[PDB]
Amino acid sequence: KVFGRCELAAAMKRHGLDNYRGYSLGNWVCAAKFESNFNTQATNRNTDGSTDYGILQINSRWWCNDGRTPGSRNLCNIPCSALLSSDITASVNCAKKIVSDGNGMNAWVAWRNRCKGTDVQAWIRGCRL
């Protein structure tokens, strides 16, 4: 599923992302935008053999099991394929563990490079939330 901007903002709000660990809704929508282009099906292979899955491009090295990342962890206790569903529940539940992990949303390179210290509230203007 390719989410519309505001459609994704509402889903994320419902699932408890709005100001989760101090990060406004703008921050999560901005990251989804640049990580996956709001596409739940997005995958991208990393040089280290790991793969990024889903709308928030969660990595197989740490977070999920794809059965092909030798020496990796499954800290969200999920198949990576769960992260590719049109329901974003598992992506969002797994993002809460990640953002809690000490580096905050710095864990997401695109957020750090493209969202951080920009006007992130733009990403949710015109949305009825």
Instruction: Say which residues have a Cβ less than 8 Å from residue 109's Cβ, sequence separation at least 6.
Output: none
Instruction: Say which residues have a Cβ less than 8 Å from residue 18's Cβ, sequence separation at least 6.
Output: 12, 24, 25, 129
Establish if 60 lies at the interface with Na ion (CB under 5 A).
yes
By CB under 5 A, name the one of 27, 57, 72, 91 that touches Na ion: 72
7 is catalytic: no
The token duo for 23 is 């990060």
What is the C-alpha separation between 2 and 14, in angstroms, rounded?
18
Q: Name the minimum Å distance from CB 65 to Na ion.
A: 5
Residue 72 binds: one of Cl ion, Na ion, none (C-beta under 5 to 8 A by kind): Na ion
52 is catalytic: yes
| Binding footprint of Na ion on the chain (CB under 5 A) | 60, 65, 69, 72, 74
| Binding region | 101
**Which residues participate in catalysis according to the annotation?**
35, 52
